[model samples]
Structures are given as C-alpha cells and as structure tokens.
Target: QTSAVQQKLAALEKSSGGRLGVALIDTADNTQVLYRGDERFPMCSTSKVMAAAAVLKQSETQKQLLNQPVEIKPADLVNYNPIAEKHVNGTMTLAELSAAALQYSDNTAMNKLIAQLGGPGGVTAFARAIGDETFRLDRTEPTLNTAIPGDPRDTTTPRAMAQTLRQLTLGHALGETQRAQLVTWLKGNTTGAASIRAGLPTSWTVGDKTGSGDYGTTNDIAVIWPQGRAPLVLVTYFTQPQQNAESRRDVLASAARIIAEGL
Candidate 1:
C-alpha cells in the first residue's frame, strides 16, 4: 500500500512540478499514507474547522455559547464574504455563524467568532490541548491567506490536520451533538467539488473543509465513510513554491483517485 501510494504521488510530482502534502488514515485498520504529511501548509480558512471546534468545545462548558448572539461590525469585513456582507451591523447566533463560516466560508462570520474566542491565540491553544503541536494560527483572514513560503504562521501539517479532524469527527474532541453539528456543516460545504470529492466513488460519504491561499495553495480535509466500513481521515494540501501561480484543483482530485486506486 505504501509503495503504490508513493509511486502514484511520484508520478504526479514528475508531471506537475508542484509540491503536495497528504495524509490518509484508515480508522478500521490503523493504517495510513502520507506524502509530506509532516510539512506545513498555510492553514488559510481551513482553520475555520479548528476555530469552530474551539467554539464548540467552549460551548460544552458554557452551554450558552452556541445560541449566543454575536454582533458583526463593519470592521470585521474582509475580502470574499458574501454571506455576511449583507448582514453588516446585523447579528448571527454563534451556531449560525459557525454554519456560515463552515459551509460558505464566510470571512466576516469567522472573524466575529474569532473575537468571541479571544482571538487566534485561543484557537491555537485549543489545538495544543488536542496534542497537535504543529497547528498554528497567527492571524485572521485574508491576512492568514498570505501563505508566504517559509513563514510558519497560520499553518498546519497535513498529519496534524488529519489527526485533529479524526478526533473531532470520530473521536472525543467534541460531545456527540457538537460533533454531529460539525460534520453536518462540513458535509454541506459548497466548495472543494473539483478536489478530493471528485476522486471518490459515489458510494462513499465525505464531510470536508476546503482551504485556499496565495502560492497556489489549495487544500481539503475530510472524514470519509466507505460503505460498511469505518471512516477514513484524508487531507490533501498542494502548493507552488513561487507566488501567485494558478492553483490546479485537478491535482487534488487526481490524488484522491490515486488513493482510492491504492486501496
């Protein structure tokens, strides 16, 4: 399994001249496939999942956090937030904000929640508590999407991402209700169609989050359940060493195809 996964990834590298980071873990058998899985890729909006988890975790104790209303100020606005743009100076409940942020990638909604969690530092600490030393959040978006090469801020390893997601989705990081809500939001996400989702057989189910940034960095992390088996945690992060290159969504799709073939 390892050799076949590596060979396909090598062929992809040879053909594309682009770098990739992948992590695939089978919950049923305790097996995995990794390619640059330890390497960091800018977290971009993928951090939304982590942030939402943090919020959900807090709500576990606070009980009032999920339905709590958060005000959206004009200052919270950023590039690419269509959902929250219409609601400037309006309000959304914490749960509503979370859904918007997850399913629609709403920037303003995310920032509002970041403030609720006491800034990016809060989310970073949440990852730490989960035993992921590699996931870091240094800034909020669109700034987080800077994705400068070698700058480690706002980044996470593919493995850290996959493992953290595994904990949240199928493990105990969240209570049953919180976990179910997170999964529903992610499964309904409007993006990533041309990426990992494109690579799967129709019989499999996926709940995923997508990330995009500068340097051609495009990523998707998901919890997938094949028919009659335990779920798989999959993360694919791709990047260009140079700046502003066109992101090839096809690479991620092809990677998924290759992973399925190996299985």
Candidate 2:
C-alpha cells in the first residue's frame, strides 16, 4: 500500500483546489515530504509556540522565576479586559501568563510576554539562538491575517516549524528542563480544539497549535501518538483558492490522524 501520508495529501490537494502546503517529518528517522506551495507563509498565533520556547529558554539561561509576577503595562494592552475573569488579578506571574497564552490562546498574555521579552527583537533572538534560519519573527498583531514586512515578527515554513517541535519535544531547544516546560505548556493550549484535537483516538493526546487566518491559511503542528508509543510530529499549512475549512479539517481528522495512529 502507498504511504498513508501521500494518500491523504492527494485527497487534500484534489478537494482544496491544490491550495494546501505541508511538511511532515518522522522524528524516528527524519524522513520528509514536501507538497503544494510548501514555502514560508504567515504563521499567525502558531508562532506563539516559538515565543513560549523563547520565554522558557530565557528563564533557564537567566534563572528567572517562572512564577514571578510580570506587570501588565499600558503598552501591553492591545485588545482585552484585564479585569475579565481569569485575568482580573493584578500583575500575573510569568508562568500564569505563559500558561494562559497557550492554554487560552490569549493574545493579551502573549503580547505582554512579547513586550517583556523585548518585543519582536526577543522573538528573533530566540529563533536565531536555536540556529534555525528559516524561522523569523516579525512583530505582529496576533489578530492580523497577513505577514508584515520588516516587522521582525512574521512568517515561517512547515519544515522549520516541525524542526522546532522536534527540538522542544527532545528538550534540545536549550536543554531538557526547558523542553519539558515548553511541551507541558503546549499541551495546555486550548485553541486548536477544532483541528489537531479533533481527529486522534480518544485515548491518545495531542499537543499542538492551530493557526488560522488570512484568506486561505489554516495550519497545525502537533506531537501525535498512535498507541501511546513514540510520538510523531506533523505540520501542515494550506493556502490558495476555494478556501475550504471543512476539507482542511477532514484531512487532519481522516488522513493525518490515520497515518499518525498506524492506520
């Protein structure tokens, strides 16, 4: 039989007007396949994964308290009520905010951390520090749909994203401690509810980030388990015409998950 990955990708391509792009790598052997226009594209909130890694790395390198209070400054305010439930308390601790950013997919929390970590500068520093040149962080509104030029915080490719996930999974992004913390928080991200989490067997858990925005971009990167054995990393970003959301979901639910689960 053909590789399940290719079969699903073909279905996605046919139904999506050939609009999707993907890069999938098996960590066990580093095998890869590129499909569609698999070049760099606007990464949306999915880039938050990098920010999460950056914060954790900084915490490890500087020995900062993950639970220490980080003030929610005026500049940090973009579009949300600090007094809202779960965020009403004053001066959120670093760990709480980071958790909120991923768990709740909270923009306010992410921007606040971006501001604290040196805005877009900190994001790029972390990307380079990891030695992944394909990844770049251009300071962007988590709400914006398009990648901004010269912004220092935008754009990423599926290959780069999968690689990053591998690093975090192995704790090689900096060391074991940082990696463990990063994955822990990723498991808490509550946004990808529709995509990455929709397929898998109820018994297996998925740690992932779902990025959706622009006219045709919907992306997801995840650590998926079949029988709870060695976890695999899967990344896909679809763009172009017909802008089919249901098809995207179907691919992940039917194809991606099947391959991931050993179907």
Candidate 3:
C-alpha cells in the first residue's frame, strides 16, 4: 500500500473529480494495491462481462454448444452499438453475441445474452453463486435519454471486479473451453483504448472490458500481461455527477502508468 503506485493513485483521484475506485493485483507475487477499492459504483456496460460469463457458464453446465445460432428478434433492438444493431432481425451464434458484448460493448448483444440467462437477475444469480454478493444487475440496456431509477446501476466494488477477472482466468469461474473463448474476446476488445489501456506499459498486453454510463460511470477491468512477466489485474471505476469521459480516462491512464512504473 505504501508504494509509488499508491501515490499516483492519490493524484488520479484529485484530478478525476469523482468518486473513484481502483484495485490492482499482481498475479506473480500476489501484491495488491487498493484505493477506495471497497466502494460500490455503477457498472454500466461492464455488467456485460458478468452477463456473458453467466451465459457461458450455463451453456457449459448444460453441455449446450455456444456456437449454436439464434435470431435477434426485432423487439430486442437498442440504439447504440451499431455494429451489433446491424445484426438485428438477423442471426448470430451465441459465441458471436459474446464477442460483440465483450469486444464492442454492444448493448443489443448484451441484452440477448441476458435474455438467454433468464434476465438481469440471472446475471446477479451467477455473481452470487461465485461469492460476489455485492454486485447487482437490475435494469436492461437503456437509451441515452432513458431514466435510470437506481443511483448505482449494476454495481460492484473495484476489488470484486478485479477478483472476478482473476478467478475467470484461473479457471475457477469458467470451464477450459469457455474461459479460452472469453479470454480471446476480452483480449480483442476494441472500445477501451482510452482507459487503462491508454497508459499501459511497453510490451504489455491487456485483456479487458469497458463500461460507460451517463453520470460518468466509466470503468475498465483487465488482466495486463507485462512482457516476460506475470500478469496483473486492474479495475478502475469513476462515478462523477458531471460526466467528463476524457478526464476520467486521463485519470485511469495516469494511474495505470504509475502502477506499471512501480511494478
């Protein structure tokens, strides 16, 4: 806790102008750094990670082929994530849906997976089953103008998020085949370049998921594999009343750089 990384994290919180939470863990030495890491924050698209994982878990338990194709009904349509919206009124395999959900943070793709899991409750059920009682999923995907009743929409502490990422990679959360696919999708993620990945160390690779919300709920959780070193997991969440996507990202980037330097 008394390290250069913690000092940079303090600076990040000052510049970010928000209620922030961060958790960093080194897989090699089991080192941990926590900054407001126990606080709950809205998860936004990050919840898709849990939702997709739940679907994958169920599929594995039932021996259902994740590659099985299913049609995206017209009623399930949403506005954002045009890449996935293009498939509306069309077909997509469960695996493809997962890719869209994880890599692109596609709302439609996430809803489809949630539907298959039964609902938002199904996602939370999976979380609870996995010993994460703090996380909760309530509403489905909403339009930009849609009113969200809860202050924290799909919430989880940074520590919980990081631990979940670690467990998934350690084969405690998903089966071998499912975990492989999940890892591939996360590594191929395209929407989080400005968050934790923005200031990643040289020659380090990240497999992560990003979430964005109206009230500056910008979050990224990932396993960062430094070149020729063990992997580290980092989870960051920013909840600002006044949304500033750029500032939030900057904070995350600065914090990540500091963590990397310390490591």
Candidate 4:
C-alpha cells in the first residue's frame, strides 16, 4: 500500500503553492521523511527553545537554581510583551521566565534569558556543541520600531530542529530532571494553540513550540504522544508568500492531522 503520510504531505505542499518545509520522525522505529527539510527558515519565537535549553544546560553544570529570582528593570523591556508589561518593576525566577517565554511567547522574558545566558552567541554555542549544523542565531528580538530585514535573525532547518527535539526527548543535552522541566514548559504552552494542537486528538499529549514571521512563515515543532503507541516528532514550516494567517494555520492543522493519523 502507498504511504498515506507521503500522500498527505504532497497535497499539503501543493495547497501551500509550493512554499512549505516538513520533517517527521518516528523515534521508536527510526523512520523519517522530509520535504524541503534542509531549507532554513526564520525561527521567530520558536528560538526560545534553544535559548531555554542553553540556560538549563548551564544550570545543570553550575548548580544554578531555576527558582533564583532576577529583578525586572527598564532594560528588560524590549517590546509590548505581556510578561514585561505586567512584571515591570517586579521580579521573576528563571523558571518563571522560561515559562513566560515558552507558554506565552513573551519576547521580553526571552530577551532577559538570552542576556543572562551571555547573549545570543551563548545559545549558538550550545547548538554548535550539540552538533546542530543547520541552526543559527544572529540577533536578539527586534524592537517595535525596528524593521525586520530580508535575512532572518534566527533560523533553522526543519530537520535540524527535529533532531534537536529528538535529542531533548532522549536526554542528550539535558539531565533527566531538566528534560522534565523543559517538557513541562512546552506542554503548557498556550500560544499557537490553533496550529498543530488543533489537529491532534484531545486525549493525546503534544508538547510543541510555534513560530511565525513575515510573508506567511509559520512553524510548529512538536513531540506528539498518541495513546497506546510510541511518541513521534513532527516539524513543519510554511512560507506562503501571500497567504494570510488563518490559511497558514489551517495548513499546519491539516498537516498535524495527517501525520497523527498515519502514526
């Protein structure tokens, strides 16, 4: 029989006007497939995962408490993010910051984490150390007035991101406890809920990170837990040059549904 997964992926790509990238991996069986998986795309807020992982790796080596608090200052204000808006002149622990960054896709909280981890290069170093060749971090979050240039500030290939998620799932870059904590943040994520999560069965647990950029670039990388079976990793990227937000989300949801069914 022909693979339903491949057929769905072809239809999804065709519907997007040929602007899409995807990587799907069944970790248990080591079966995988890709569509434009090597092409790099802007990571947007999805970059937070790498930043968070870098911090957690340091926390493990340095014995830094995740609950350690840092005072929020005017410098922490990067843009119009709910976390910085509400927590200005307040304090939040590293753990809380990670939660805000991941759960809510808060830019200010992510910026603080990047600064604390010794800037964007720090996250890049962690990726390099872990052998992620297709991921790159060049700039911090852009200000409200700052225009996004042609080049993406942060970018990664679908395959590279899938690999990163697989490594994280297997405790390759973090200890067991740290892995648990990071997974918690991802599963509790509230932003981009209409994307991949919209297509999965409610009972199944999906821990994912979402990203969006100009020109209809939308992405979701997820570890999906289907009841009574092995877990799978699904990474999807869409760059529909003229597609609207709603349509892009539809593409993701449809992709997720197809992958979930095939799995």
Candidate 5:
C-alpha cells in the first residue's frame, strides 16, 4: 500500500510540477502517512468547512444563534469579489447566510456570518472549542500575505482538514444535532466540483468544501466514497505558478482519485 501510494504521488508530482501536497487516511485501519499526518496547506475555501463548523459549534454553545436575523450591512462585505453585489443590498437570516456561504461559497454571506460570529475572534473561539489550534480564519486571504511565514491565520493542513471533517461527521465536534446540520451543509458545498468529484464510483457520497485564492491556490477536503466498505478522507492542496483553475483542479482530482483507488 505504501509503495502504491508513493507511486501515485510521484505521478501527480510529475504532472503538477511538484506543486501539490496530499494526505489520505483509512479511517477503518487507523493508518496514516506520519510525516504528512499533520501537514498544513492553504485550504482555500476548504477552510470554510471549519468556518461552517465554527458556526454550528458556536450555535450549540449559544454563543451565536443559527436562526437569528443577521443584518447584512455594507461594512460586512469582506470578500470584495464582484459577487458581493448579491448580498450587499439585503439582510438575511444567519441560517440563510451560513447556507449561502457553504452551498455556493458565497463570499459576502461568509463575511456576514463571520461578523455575526463576532468576526475573526469568534472563529478563533470556535477552533478552541474543538480543541484544534492548527486552523485559522483569514478574513484576509492568505494569498496576499505570502511574505509572512506561518501566516497562521488563513491556513490548515490536509490532515488537519480531514480530522476536522472526521470530527464533524462523527458528531464529536459540534454534538449530535449540530453535527447533523453541519454534514447537511457540507453536502451542499458545490464549489470544489472539479476536484473531489473528478472521478469515482458512480455511487458515492463525496461531501466536501472547496477553497480558492489568487494565483491558483486551490484546496479541497472530503470523504470520498463515504458509503464504501473502507471510507477514506482525501485532501489535496496546490499553489500554482500561474492562474489555471481547471488545469490545477484536474491535477488535484487525478492525484486524489488515483491514490484513493490504490488505497
């Protein structure tokens, strides 16, 4: 299994110019690539899973209410993307905001949700609640802060992401009800279509989140083949030398698919 996995990694490295990092785990066997078991990566919008988990976790603690009306003010617009137009002109419930943020990776909705969660500080509190310190909320995208080593604020490792998802799925991160709600939200995460859904059995539950940043930094984490006998957590992250979402996504997808098939 190790040799096969390494060969798959080598093939991906060759095609991706060695700009990819991947981590996989057999939740059934409790085996992992020890060196990469804790490796960190950009996570892009994949980090939103953590943000979404934060929302549910905090709500469970009554720190924030899921159904409360959250005013979507102009100042809350942080994504700064052109799509901000959709959210800039109205107010939505925290439930709706959270859904938009996860289902469509809505930037403005995320900004509003984060604001409702009390901004980055609230996100930090959410992480602390889960007993994981390796993940951070980058209200400011990590792409812009490359000069800062261990920016710590806008990143996570593939393994840490898998762990986060595993926690959410197992009802360990946000308790039973909240965990169910979180899994539902994650099932609606459609942004990483090109990566996690690249290739797989015709029947499989691939619940995941996608994150993207400038210069083609694409990241995704999810349980591929959740219904299979041996469920697996697969995460792939890449930093492109150029802007090629499709190309980089193909590489990530291909790499993940190959490794999962072998495992």
Candidate 6:
C-alpha cells in the first residue's frame, strides 16, 4: 500500500504539473507518514488557522474578545475578502473576523486578524510557542498568491502544519475551551469541499482549513474522525511553477483518498 500510494502520488504530480507534500498522523497509535513533508510550500490562506489559533490563545490570557470592535478601513481590503469587504469602514470583533477568515477564506479578515496579533511575525512566534518551529508567516495577504520558486520566506512543511493541527485540536496547545472553539470554526468551514472532505466517507466527521492561490499553490490542513477509529491528522500542500494557474484540487482530494483508504 505504501509503494502503491507513492505511485499514485507520482501520478498526481505528473498530471497536475507539480509536487505534493503530505503528512499523516494516527493519534490512536502515534504513527506517521510523510512524503516530502519537510519541504516548504507557500502557506497562502492556510496561515489563517495559525493566526486564528494565536488569537484564540491570546484570548485566554486577555479574555472577553467579543466586546472589542476592531476597526476595518478601506485600505485593509483585498481580493477574495467576502466577509471583511462588507465590513469596510466598519468593525468586527476578533471572533467575528476569525470566523469569516476560516469559514469563508476572507483575505481582509485574515489581514485584520494578523494585524491584531502583531502581523505575520507574531503569528510565527505564537506557533513556535505551541511547539512548532517550522511554520512561518513572513507576509500578510495579497502577497499570498505571489511566489518565486524556492523562495522560503512564507512557507511551511506538511509535517509542521499537520503537527500544528494535531497539537491544537487533539493535544495541549490550546485550553479546552479554545480548543473546542477552534474545532467548531474549522468544522463550520465553507471552503474545503474540494479538499480532504471530498475524499472522505461522508459519514466521517472532519474539521479542516483550506488555502487556495495562484503560483500553483493549494493547501488543506485537517483532522478527521473515521467511524469507530481515533482521529487522523492530515496536511497537504501542493505547488508548481505555473504562475497563472492553480494546482488541481483533485490532486489534493485523491491524495486524501489514498490516506483514508489505508486507515
């Protein structure tokens, strides 16, 4: 199955015109599978999950984020900002912004949330604090879709992202309340239909975050509950040199199918 999986992955790469990075973890036994898992790929909107995690963790020490109305100016808006765009020259709480970013993949919503956490640097620091040293957010939105091959500035490993999702969702990185909240946000996400969710049994419960962008980059970080089994954590980041095209979602979904069938 392992070698067969590799062949399928290569087939995906051949057909999609890119490389695939994957990380799989079974929490019941602490087993792992990694395919180029340490190599970097542009983070794109997947960074929102980490930033949201950071913000939610901060809420633990600082508390009561519901009342703080964060300002949103016209300058803060960017493409694909469905939620934040509507709130231009308006305000939304951190919780509201995070919901939008995660569920809707709102670019401006992510931008404002990252700004609240002190920009990309702050998000990276928070990830490190939670036992992830490999994830980094070097820049905010608009730049997310633009990448030069081999530029390592704003990227993360598949292992790093999968581990981060596992830690946050099933480990100790967040308090019980925040951890549950994070799962709720991810479970409610509206953007992952073409990702891991698409490859699942449909009876299985899944919580995931997705990233889509140009420069042939697409990513999904997910926690899955297959019937009667312990949860599974999977992360995939795909990249190619095609500046104007996006990588195929089928590559990601097929990769998910490969991982799920083995479980």
Top model by lDDT, which number?
A: 1
Assess candidate 6 and give its TM-score to the true structure: 0.96
Clashing residue pairs, backbone N/CA/C < 3 A, model 3: none
Put down candidate 5 lDDT per residue, 227-246, tens digits, no spaces: 65766777777765644433
lDDT at position 203, candidate 4: 88
The whole-model lDDT of each prediction reads 0.87, 0.66, 0.78, 0.78, 0.66, 0.86
TM-score result, candidate 5: 0.84
* lDDT tens per residue, model 4, 172-249: 778888898888888888876788888889888899988776656777888888788788888887765543433377
Candidate 4 local Cα displacement, residue 161, angstroms: 0.3
lDDT of 6 by residue, 143-262 (tens): 965756788877889988989999999988999999999999999998898888898899999999888777768889999988999999999888777787756777889889987776
Off by over 4 Å in 6: none
lDDT-sorted candidate list, best first: 1, 6, 3, 4, 2, 5
The 10-residue segment with the lowest total lDDT in model 2: 144-153
Identify the runs in model 1 with alpha carbons over 4 angstroms from their true place. none
lDDT of 2 by residue, 9-52 (tens): 67756776635556666666667665542467667667778887
Clash pairs detected, candidate 4: none
Best candidate (score: TM-score): 1
Instruction: Order the candidates by TM-score, highest first.
Output: 1, 6, 3, 4, 5, 2
Q: Whole-model lDDT, candidate 6?
A: 0.86
lDDT of 1 by residue, 11-93 (tens): 89668777888899999997989988888888788899999999999888888888888777788789988888777788789
- CA shift at 199, candidate 6, in angstroms? 1.3
TM-score of each: 0.96, 0.82, 0.91, 0.89, 0.84, 0.96
Residue 196 of model 2 has an lDDT of: 60
- Spell out the clash pairs found in candidate 2: 137-152, 137-153, 137-154, 138-152, 138-153, 138-154, 139-152, 139-153
Tens-place lDDT digits, model 3, residues 1-263: 35666767777787767777788989998888888888778888878888888888888866665777778877777866665667777888888888888898878888788888888898989998888878888878864212132455578889888888888865478889888877888999998788898888657888889877766666788888889888899998776766443436776777677777777
